[PDB]
């Protein structure tokens, strides 16, 4: 099946992202805009720190800063929770544990506001080392590919999601960030609850050569996989 929510994503959709953050007491705000094309699992966005210098590395914020733009193949469209919750949207909550360092806890609402898919987030970070990889800005400005593992939480009418991000460091080491996530629908309508599957996620970071503010340009491609081939023909 294809959910009614998925019909909202068959063309190019404008995206807005607003994040209000506080990490070890360093307050900051990020705004982003761009567009997604879930037909190709593609996002293209530019984010700006509107409060000055970002007090954490940009790569640490990529997962917090719209999984409804993932491409689900045909035999797996009945497993797309994220589009099925649209346009009313969903609440996405995480705790992200940076190995040997602090944690982010985030709560976001992802939903349509008019024609635009908007992700509004609050983030709180604590327990960071002032000279660790994060507040000491030792992460390279790049990003790896990851698998985002998804399972249904039928009790909560949503999903539980987990994965481990690898952030590359200049000296050849890696800073690991373990992500524990759950998503729940905002509205009343039925949502699709999936079988166990994963998203294969790729992200590339760049800069706008005419932008003086602290910023990140991001390109992402995300495709779902891993459903056995249960629903062989369906």
Curated annotation (Swiss-Prot):
Query: What's a Pfam family in this record?
Result: GFP
The protein finds application as follows: Green fluorescent protein has been engineered to produce a vast number of variously colored mutants, fusion proteins, and biosensors. Further generation of mutants led to more stable proteins (at 37 degrees Celsius for example) with brighter fluorescence and longer fluorescence lifetimes.
The observed outcome of changing residue 222 to R is: In Azurite; shifts the excitation and emission spectra to shorter wavelengths and increases quantum yields compared to BFP
Effect the entry attributes to changing residue 78 to R: In Azurite; shifts the excitation and emission spectra to shorter wavelengths and increases quantum yields compared to BFP
Question: What does the PTM comment state?
Answer: Contains a chromophore consisting of modified amino acid residues. Maturation of the chromophore requires nothing other than molecular oxygen.
> What tissue specificity is annotated for this entry?
Photocytes.
Effect of changing residue 31 to R: reported as: In mut1.28; shifts fluorescence lifetime from 3.03 to 2.76 ns. In mut2.2; shifts fluorescence lifetime from 3.03 to 1.94 ns. In mut3.3; shifts fluorescence lifetime from 3.03 to 1.88 ns
Effect the entry attributes to changing residue 148 to I: In Azurite; shifts the excitation and emission spectra to shorter wavelengths and increases quantum yields compared to BFP
Q: What is the effect of changing residue 47 to L?
A: In mut3.3; shifts fluorescence lifetime from 3.03 to 1.88 ns. In R10-3; matures to the red-emitting state with excitation and emission maxima at 555 and 585 nm, respectively
Result after altering residue 160 to Q: In R10-3; matures to the red-emitting state with excitation and emission maxima at 555 and 585 nm, respectively
Q: Altering residue 169 to L: what's the impact?
A: In R10-3; matures to the red-emitting state with excitation and emission maxima at 555 and 585 nm, respectively
Q: Which family does it belong to?
A: Belongs to the GFP family.
Name the job this protein performs.
Energy-transfer acceptor. Its role is to transduce the blue chemiluminescence of the protein aequorin into green fluorescent light by energy transfer. Fluoresces in vivo upon receiving energy from the Ca(2+)-activated photoprotein aequorin.
> What name has this protein been given in UniProt?
Green fluorescent protein
Give the source species: Aequorea victoria
Q: Which gene encodes it?
A: GFP
């Amino acid at each position: 099946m294809v959910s009614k929510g998925e019909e909202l994503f068959t063309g190019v959709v404008p995206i807005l992202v607003e994040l209000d953050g506080d990490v070890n007491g360093h307050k900051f705000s990020v705004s982003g805009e761009g567009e997604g094309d879930a037909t190709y699992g593609k996002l293209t966005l530019k984010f700006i720190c509107t409060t000055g210098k970002l007090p954490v590395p940009w790569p640490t914020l990529v997962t917090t800063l719209v999984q409804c733009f993932s491409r689900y193949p045909d035999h797996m469209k009945q497993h797309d929770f994220f589009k099925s919750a649209m346009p009313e949207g969903y609440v996405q909550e995480r705790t992200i544990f940076f190995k040997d360092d602090g944690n982010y806890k985030t709560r976001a609402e992802v939903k349509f506001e008019g024609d635009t898919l908007v992700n509004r987030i609050e983030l709180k970070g604590i327990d960071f080392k002032e000279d660790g990889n994060i507040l000491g800005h030792k992460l390279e400005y790049n990003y790896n590919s990851h698998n985002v593992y998804i399972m249904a939480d039928k009790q909560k009418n949503g999903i539980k999601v987990n994965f481990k991000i690898r952030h590359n460091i200049e000296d050849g080491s890696v800073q690991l960030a373990d992500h524990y996530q759950q998503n729940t629908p905002i509205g009343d309508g039925p949502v699709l609850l999936p079988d166990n599957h994963y998203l294969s996620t790729q992200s590339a970071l760049s800069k706008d050569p005419n932008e003086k503010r602290d910023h990140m340009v991001l390109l992402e491609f995300v495709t779902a996989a891993g459903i056995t081939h249960g629903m062989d023909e369906l």
